[PDB]
Structures are given as C-alpha cells and as structure tokens.
C-alpha cells in the first residue's frame, strides 16, 4: 500500500464501523412491522394484552417480534409522511362495532388507506372489536342507524355479515392483497396467534411472488 500509518488506522476504524453496521442491520432484520390504524375508540391501544411522536408498541409471541406503529397523532397531511411506512408487513385496522358514526369514519379511513398509491401490495388484518356488546345492541336496535339502506332482520348474524361484507367491499385492489377479518371477543386469546398466522402467510406469499412461483 501507499498509505501512511494514520491512514491505515483510519481504514481499520472504518472497517470496525462497517462490521458494527452489519450486525445492527442483521439484528433489525429479525422483526415484523405493523401499521396499527382505526378510530380512537376502536381499542387499538388494547389490541394485544402482551403489550408527541409516533406511538410505538413492541411484543414477541411464539418467537416473532412485532413493532406496531400508531400514527393517528400525526395530524398533518398524510400524503407527505405515508411513504415512510411503505416497507411494513401489514396494516392492522381495528373497527368499533358498537358505535355507528365511529364505524362510519372507520370505513372512510379504511378506504383511504386501502386505496393509496403506496400500499398497493400490502394486506389488512381487520379486527371487529366489541363483538358481543354490539351484538346485544343490535338486538336492541337495528343496523339501520348507519347502514340505513341495508335490509335485514334484528339477528346479530345478518348485521355482522353485512358489516364485514361492506368493509371488504370498499376494497378495490383485490388483485394484490387479501383481508383477514377477525371477530374480536372481549376476552379473546387468539389475537396474537392470529397476527402470527397472518404475518407468516403474507411472508410466504411474498417469497412466492419474488421467486415468481405465485
């Protein structure tokens, strides 16, 4: 080499920094990122019992780390900060079944997020929170409160089926995404397991798509 001693020492320092960057990147690679969205009353803050900037939550279930980001605090225009979340595994959308106006702007937000120009290859885990409470409420009063055009009996089955069919029918990019809908019980113990299953399935689909086998 034509270097001096100090130049060689600087090169050695740079190599050490490169090694540290490699280890940190490989460590950060072993994680799953989720975009937690929904109304303020949806219950997103209590979605997983395992537990102003972006709201961040982290949990590990069955040897898999998950970082959920809530970005409802950011009240600026979403167009100029939504591209920072294009490289995430899935969008977890929580809907409040009981409240009617809440679920209405929940449909608005669902359509807005699903029809973005960035999230054209990402899927939604749709948690229909407040299942049985809204079931009793719909026993008391029909779904005509918000879904006025909808015609159905007072049974919970028809109303819940219509609501799920709606929330899946606002979707337009059905070619490269798939919604995973889950009726959320008050004491549901399958939430983390459901997220695990959905993440594994979508990662398998991602392998299939890059390898061209899908």
């Amino acid at each position: 080499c034509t270097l001096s001693a100090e130049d060689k020492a600087a090169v050695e320092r740079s190599k050490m920094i490169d090694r540290n960057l490699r280890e940190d990147g490989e460590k950060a690679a072993r994680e799953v990122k989720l975009l937690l969205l929904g109304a303020d009353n949806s219950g997103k803050s209590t979605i997983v019992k395992q537990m102003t900037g972006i709201v961040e939550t982290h949990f590990t279930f069955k040897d898999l780390h998950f970082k959920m980001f809530d970005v409802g605090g950011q009240r600026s225009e979403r167009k100029k900060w939504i591209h920072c979340f294009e490289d995430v595994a899935a969008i977890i959308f929580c809907v409040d079944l009981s409240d009617y106006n809440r679920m209405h702007e929940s449909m608005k937000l669902f359509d807005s997020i699903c029809n973005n120009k960035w999230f054209t290859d990402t899927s939604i885990i749709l948690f229909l929170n407040k299942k049985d409470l809204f079931e009793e409420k719909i026993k008391k009063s029909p779904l005509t409160i918000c879904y006025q055009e909808y015609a159905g009996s007072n049974t919970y089955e028809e109303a819940a089926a219509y609501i799920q069919c709606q929330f899946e029918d606002l979707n337009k990019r059905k070619d490269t995404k798939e919604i995973y809908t889950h009726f959320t019980c008050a004491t549901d113990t399958k939430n983390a397991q459901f997220i695990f299953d959905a993440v594994t399935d979508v990662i398998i689909k991602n392998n299939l798509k890059d390898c061209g086998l899908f």
Partner: protein, 51 residues
C-alpha cells in the same frame, strides 16, 4: 420450492442460494460430471463397430 416454503425467517429477501439464474448453474454443475466422464471415455478408449 422446498427452500422457499420452509424458511420461516421474516428476512427471506436474501436469494444467494435460490432464485435468479443460479438454478441453471446448479443444473450445469450436476451435468458436468457426465460431460467429464464422456470426454475421458471418448479420449482413452473409443467404442467402435465390430463384425
């Protein structure tokens, strides 16, 4: 197909052992032994017609 389906790692973007066109190289590597044996056979003892 097996390697793609089995790996549970979230970071499966690494494709240095599967995908792209390395599969063609592996096929050629498998057939290289037969090519070599045929070459040696035809250079050291060629078969010939007999009456």
């Amino acid at each position: 197909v097996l390697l793609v389906f089995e790996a549970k790692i979230p970071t499966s973007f690494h494709r240095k052992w599967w995908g792209l066109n390395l599969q063609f190289l592996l096929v050629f590597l498998c057939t290289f032994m037969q090519i070599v044996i045929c070459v040696i056979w035809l250079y050291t003892a060629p078969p010939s017609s007999y009456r």
